[PDB]
Amino acid sequence: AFHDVPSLGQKVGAGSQKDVFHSRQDPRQCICLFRPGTTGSIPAEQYAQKELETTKQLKNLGFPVVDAHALVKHQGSVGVAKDFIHNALDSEDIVNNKKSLPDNLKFNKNVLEDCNAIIRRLKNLEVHIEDLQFLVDHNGHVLINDPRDVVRSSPDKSISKVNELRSHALNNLLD
């Protein structure tokens, strides 16, 4: 199920869970390989498969996602081939105040609206997304990234994760 990627492109970005490489096979894509210690006691192949399926379930349910395309391996590293989000902001940096949303108006409106849309869908479908996190693309659109699971459950936990990011955009638009 896991396809070999013979050569990685240039490394990009800075996420703690995966190291991300430009895909030498499709410049719209990137190769995202688990770093040591990031899959807990679950083997990395199972973890990658769970992320791919969950991304596709969320995509099918209408959520905005960092789409995932194929399970890959390179030497002994394991991961997923994914859409490459140029200049992505990692939601974790935002909420931990390691990076800030730009001042741009359109940018912040997009973060606000898309968060609202994600929250609206969480409520309607009543699902919980385990390890919910986001990438914000260069126009301010919010994309669910590397979801671990989705189950029919109380969406309150997931709604709280989204509002955590929305607050920043709301705060900017109020000032």
Give the CB-side neighbour count of residue 106, counting CA atoms within 13 A.
Answer: 3
131 classed as catalytic: yes
d(CA 113, CA 28): 25
Entry resolution in angstroms?
Answer: 2.2
Does 23 count as an annotated binding residue?
A: no
Dihedral sign of CA atoms 125, 139, 102, 11 in order: positive
Active-site position among 4, 67, 131, 137: 131
**Which of 83, 109, 143 is where one domain is finished?**
83
- Following CA atoms 113, 60, 86, 14 in sequence, which dihedral angle do they give, to the nearest 10 degrees? 100
d(CA 63, CA 128): 13
Q: Checking DSSP bridges between strand 77-83 and strand 134-136, what pairing results, if any? A: unpaired
Does 133 count as an annotated binding residue?
A: yes
Asked whether residue 64 falls in the same domain as residue 101, the answer is no
Domains in the chain, number? 2
Does 83 count as an annotated binding residue?
A: yes
Give the CATH number, domain containing residue 10: 3.30.200.20
Asked whether residue 103 falls in the same domain as residue 78, the answer is no
Instruction: Write down the number of H helices and E strands in the chain.
Output: 4, 11
Experimental approach was: X-ray
Q: Collect all residues with Cβ–Cβ distance below 8 Å to 2 and sequence separation of at least 6.
A: 45, 48, 71, 72, 73, 78
d(CA 170, CA 162): 12
d(CA 50, CA 60): 15
In the numeric block, the tokens 């391996």 are attached to 73
Nearest Cα residue to 117 out of 85, 159, 167, 154: 159
d(CA 53, CA 67): 11
Does 90 count as an annotated binding residue?
A: yes
